[PDB]
Amino acid sequence: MFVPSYYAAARPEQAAELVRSNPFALVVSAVDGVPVATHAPVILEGDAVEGGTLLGHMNRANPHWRSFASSPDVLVVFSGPHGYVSPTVYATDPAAPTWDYAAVHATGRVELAEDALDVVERTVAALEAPRDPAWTPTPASREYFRALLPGVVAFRVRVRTEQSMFKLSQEQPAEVYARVREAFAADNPGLADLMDRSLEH
Amino acid sequence: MFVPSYYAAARPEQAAELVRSNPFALVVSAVDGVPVATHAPVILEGDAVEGGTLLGHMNRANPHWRSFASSPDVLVVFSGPHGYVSPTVYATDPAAPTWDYAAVHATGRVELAEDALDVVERTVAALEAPRDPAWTPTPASREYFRALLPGVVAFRVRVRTEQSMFKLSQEQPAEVYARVREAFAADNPGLADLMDRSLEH
Ligand code: HEM
Ligand code: HEM
Ligand SMILES: N[C@@H](CCCNO)C(=O)O
Ligand SMILES: N[C@@H](CCCNO)C(=O)O
C-alpha cells in the first residue's frame, strides 16, 4: 500500500480506532512466494498498532496456519467503511470516478498462540461490547467453547510496521468535497462519519 | 483460504457474479517473502474466473507494480457482503458467534498492461452501468483521462486458480438459519440476498 500525503492519518490514534472498529480482517502470508489469505476476526492488544500485538484465530482444518510455525512475516489488512465515488455526485467536469476507503496494513512476525481459549473469549467480549443488548456466554456456552478448542488455531502477530490509508476525497476542492459528504450521509453514513473524523486535527 | 464443504459455491457462475458485483478488490503480491497489498478496482474479462483475465489499475507512484515486471504470481481478493453473527440472533444455547461473508480468491500471473486507457475506460463503464442515472464521460473528461495516463499503471492477471467462500450460516439448523436471515433482512439486505442465492441449486 502506498499512501499519498493527503490521505495520511491526521492522528496516530486514527489507525488503532479503525482496527478496533473493524475486526474482521484479512491475514496474509507468503507461502514460498505465493500469497495466501484467510478472513478471520483479529483484535488489538495495546494503545498503538505499531509495536502492538494482534490476536486472532482460524480453523485448524485451514492449512494456512501450518505456514506460521516458522514464524514468517505476515500482513493483516483491516478495512473500514468504503464506497464508490461517481462523478454524478461531483457535479463538475472534467472528472474521473474513484473509490473512497480507509484501511490499516499491519506487518509483523506471526506465532502460534497456546492460549486459544483466552483469544476467542477476548474476541467475543470485544465484538459484543458495542451491542445493546450484548451477548454474554452462558456457563454452558463457555463449556462449549472448551469443547470446540481442538478444532481452532489461535495466533499472535507482533506488529513491526503500520501503514494507514484514509482515502476520503481530500483531493477534491471544497465545494465538491461537500457534495461527496452529503451523498454518503444518505447512502453510507459510516463513511460520511469517517470523512468527518479525518478532518479532525 | 480454506473452504469447508458446506460453504462451497453451489454454481460455478456464483464466483463470477461476486467478482462483477464487488470490483473494489485487494491485489496481493509476495515481494521477496513479504506480502504487499494494494486496494484497487479490478474487472473481469470472461465468463468464468478460473481461466479468465482480470484487469485493474493503480497509482504509478505506488511502487507495488514495480514487483509485477518479473510477472510473479499474485492473489486478487474480491469481497462481497459480510456481517457479524451474534448468538443473540440465534436464540439458542449453547452457541458461539461467527462472521458471515462471501469472497473469491483468484491467483495467477500478473503482467503490466500497455493499453491503460482501455482498462480505465472499461472500469468506468462497468462501475457506472448499474447506476441510474449512470455517468458517461463527456468528451472533455475523455481528454482528461488521456492527460492522466502518465500517472497510472494498468495490469492484467491471468487467473490460474479460483476459490470461493460462501460462509452464510449453512452450518446452523434450519430454525436458527431462518432467524439469521430475518435479522440481516433489516440490518444488511445485501447479505440476506446473498444467503437467498446461495441456497439456489
Ligand atoms: C466474535 C467471536 C467469533 C467470530 C467473529 C468468529 C469467527 C470465525 C471465523 C470467520 C472462522 C473461520 C476461519 C477460517 O476460515 O479458517 C472461525 C473458525 C472457528 N472458530 Fe471462531 N469466531 C468467534 C468466536 C469463536 C469462539 C468463542 C470459539 C470457541 C472455541 C471459536 C472457535 C472456532 C472454531 C472451532 C473454528 C473452526 C471450525 C468452525 O468454523 O466451527 N470461535 N471463527
Ligand atoms: C470506476 C472508475 C475508477 C475507480 C474506482 C478508480 C479508483 C482508483 C483508486 C482506488 C486508485 C488508487 C490506487 C493506488 O492506491 O495505487 C486510483 C488511482 C489512479 N487512477 Fe483511478 N479509478 C477509476 C478510474 C480512473 C480513470 C478513468 C483514470 C484515467 C486515466 C484513472 C487514473 C488514475 C490515476 C492517474 C491514479 C493515480 C493518482 C490518482 O489517484 O489520481 N482512474 N484510481
Ligand atoms: N485524482 C483524479 C483522478 C482519479 C482517477 N482514479 O480514481 C481526480 O480525482 O480526478
Ligand atoms: N461452528 C460453531 C463454532 C463457531 C466458532 N467460530 O465462529 C458454531 O456455529 O457454534
- Integer Cα distance of A23 and A17 in angstroms: 11
Other CB atoms within 10 A of residue B158 CB? 14
Cα angle A20, A26, A28; round to 5 = 130
Tell me which chain B residues have a C-beta less than 8 angstroms from the C-beta of A96.
120, 124, 137, 141, 144-145, 148
Kindly state whether B163 is in contact with chain A, defined as any CB-CB distance less than 8 angstroms: no
B48 alpha carbon to ligand 2 midpoint, in Å? 25
- Integer Cα distance of A44 and A49 in angstroms: 7
Give domain status of residue B90, yes or no. Answer: yes
Give domain status of residue B198, yes or no. Answer: no
- Spell A132-163 as b/e; 16+ CB within 10 A means b: eeebebeeebbeebeeeeeebbbbbbebeebb
Give domain status of residue A184, yes or no. Answer: yes
Cα angle A44, A46, A47; round to 5 = 110
Contact between A100 and A191 (Cβ < 8 Å): yes
Total domains, chain B: 1
Other CB atoms within 10 A of residue A164 CB? 24
3-class DSSP state for residue A63?
helix
C-alpha dihedral over A102, B27, A74, B96, to 10 degrees?
70
Q: Which residue has the cell 499474485?
A: B74
Name the residue among B81, B72, B85 with its Cα closest to residue B24. B81
Contact between B78 and B169 (Cβ < 8 Å): no
Give domain status of residue A199, yes or no. Answer: no
Give domain status of residue A200, yes or no. Answer: no
Provide the resolution (angstroms).
1.5
Cβ neighbours of residue A139 under 8 Å, at least 6 residues apart? none
A89 alpha carbon to ligand 3 midpoint, in Å? 14
**Within its chain, how far is the Cα of A195 from the centroid?**
17
Which ligand 1 atom is nearest residue B101's CA?
10
Mind spelling out the 3-state secondary structure of chain B? CCCCHHHCCCCCHHHHHHHHHCCEEEEEEEECCEEEEEEEEEEEECCCCCCCEEEEEEECCCHHHHHCCCCCEEEEEEEEEEEEECHHHHCCCCCCCEEEEEEEEEEEEEEEECCHHHHHHHHHHHHHCCCCCCCCCCHHHHHHHHHHHHHEEEEEEEEEEEEEEEECCCCCCHHHHHHHHHHHHHHCHHHHHHHHHHCCC
- Integer Cα distance of A199 and A197 in angstroms: 5
Name the residue among B165, B161, B162 with its Cα closest to residue B7. B165
Point out which residues pair with B44 in neighbouring strands: B54
Give domain status of residue A22, yes or no. Answer: yes
Angle between helices B116-128 and B139-148 (to 10 degrees): 130
Cell of B169: 450460516
H runs (alpha helix) in chain A: 13-21, 87-90, 116-128, 139-148, 174-187, 189-198
Q: Give pairs for A134-140: CB < 8 Å, separation 24+.
A: A134/B88, A135/B86, A135/B87, A135/B88, A135/B97, A137/B94, A137/B96, A138/B93, A138/B94, A140/B93, A140/B94
Q: Which residue has the cell 454518503?
A: A184
**Within its chain, how far is the Cα of A13 from the centroid?**
14
For residue B147, the domain's CATH number is: 2.30.110.10
H runs (alpha helix) in A13-163: 13-21, 87-90, 116-128, 139-148
- Ligand 2 pocket: which residues have CB below 6 Å? A 2, 96-99; B 38, 40-41, 57-59, 62, 120, 123-124, 127, 145, 148-149, 151-152
Cell of B28: 496481493
The amino acid present at A152, given as its one-letter code, is V
Peptide bond into B72 cis (omega under 30): no
Give domain status of residue B185, yes or no. Answer: yes
Q: Which residue has the cell 480468491?
A: B105
Cell of A43: 483484535
Q: Which residue has the cell 483468484?
A: B106
Give the domain range for residue B11: 5-193
Instruction: Look at ligand 2, atom 13, and give the residue with the nearest C-alpha.
Output: B58
Cβ neighbours of residue B180 under 8 Å, at least 6 residues apart? B85, B89, B90, B100, B169, B172, B195
Contact between B57 and B40 (Cβ < 8 Å): yes
**Within its chain, how far is the Cα of B150 from the centroid?**
27
Give domain status of residue A177, yes or no. Answer: yes
Cβ neighbours of residue B195 under 8 Å, at least 6 residues apart? B100, B168, B169, B180, B181, B184
- Integer Cα distance of B126 and A86 in angstroms: 12
Q: Closest approach of chain B CAs to the CA of A141, in angstroms?
A: 4
Per DSSP, A175 falls in state H
